[PDB]
Amino acid sequence: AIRKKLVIVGDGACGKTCLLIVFSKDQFPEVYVPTVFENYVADIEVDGKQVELALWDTAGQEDYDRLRPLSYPDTDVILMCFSIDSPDSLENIPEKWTPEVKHFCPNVPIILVGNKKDLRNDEHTRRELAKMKQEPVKPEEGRDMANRIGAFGYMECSAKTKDGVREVFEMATRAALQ
C-alpha cells in the first residue's frame, strides 16, 4: 500500500473530531464519545488501489497560529469542514481557512465538507437559528462556496447517523492519489 496523509481543518464547532472518530472506530461510540483524536492509519481500497491513509485533526490548534501549521507538512489531501447548523462556520472558510491552507499546502486538493447534515431537518436547530435571522446551510450554498474557493469537490455527511462518512474518506483517498 502507498502511504498518504490527510488533515481536517475548520472552526472549533465544525464536527471534525467526531467525523474522524466515527470513521476510525470499528464500533460506533454508543457509550462514550471521545473528546480528542490522537491519529489513525486507515486501510482503504479505492478503485482497485490499496492505500494507508494517515488521519490528523487540528482541533485544539485553532487559536495558535504558530503551532497549527506544524500539522501541514507533506499533507496529500485536506478535508475543510464546516457545520450545516452553523452558517457562521461557512463564512470563515474563504478568508480565514482557505488562504492558510493554500499557503502551507500549495497544490493540495481541498474537499469542502458540510458536517451534521442531519440537523438540516431538526426543529430545535431551525428554531435556534431563526432567532439570529439565520437558517441551516443550504446544499447550493455549500456547493457555491466550494466552487468559489477552488475546492476539488463538495460533499456532505452526518457523523451521528454515519451517512456519507465512508464516501468522504474514499473520495479523499482518490484526491490524494491524483
Add this chain to the structure above:
Amino acid sequence: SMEMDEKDFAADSWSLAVDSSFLQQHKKEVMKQQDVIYELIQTELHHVRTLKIMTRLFRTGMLEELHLEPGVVQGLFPCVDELSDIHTRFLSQLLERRRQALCPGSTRNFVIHRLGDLLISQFSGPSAEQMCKTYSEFCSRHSKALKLYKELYARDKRFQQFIRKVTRPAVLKRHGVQECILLVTQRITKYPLLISRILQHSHGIEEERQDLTTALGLVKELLSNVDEGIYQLEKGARLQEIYNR
C-alpha cells in the same frame, strides 16, 4: 507501557472499566465526569508511550546499530529525554491519584474527586517553566527533524532497512518517526479540550470547579507562551534570511 497500566486503561471508557455493580451506585453526572478524567489519563499513558518509542526504539536503536554522523540522532529526536521526564512524572502523579482512590478489595473501582489541584501544580511554577521551554525548543525544531528524517531515508540504505524493520509490527502502525513528532507537537493543545469537558461535569463541589477553572487558565497561558516562542529552524538557513524575518 507496562501491562498493569494497559489493562487498567484497556476499556473505551471509565463506565466500561469499572464493575457494573460499582457503576450502578453513581449519579449520571459523576459517571460523565469520570469518563473524561479517564480519557485524560489514558491519552497521557499513550503520550508517554509515544515518547518511549522515540527514545528506546528509534533513538537508541540508531545509536547502537547505525553509524550516523554526530548530532544527527539529536536532530531527529530533539528534547525527547526532557519531554519523557516531564510527562512520566505527570503520568506518575495521575496514576497515583487513581490508585489512592481504589476501593479496598478492588484494582479497577475508583472515583477521582480532586483532579484540579494536581493540574494547577503541573501547569504552574517550575514545572510549567520547564514545559514552556521544552515545547518552545521542540516545536521550533519540528520541521528540521522531518526534513532530516526524509533526507536519511532517501540516501541511506541501512537507515531505510532499520526503519522498515522496527516499524514493521502492527502495534507500530501509527508510530513512525514523523507520526511520533506530530503526536508530541499536538499533545499540548489537547489539554484545554479535556480540562474544559471535565470542568463541564465538575460543578457539584465549588472548590473543584474553581481549581479546574484556574487549571484551564494556566494551560492556556502556557500554550500562548509556547506559540509566541516558536521560530522554525532550517538546516543551512543563512543569517540574512533570519534577520530579514
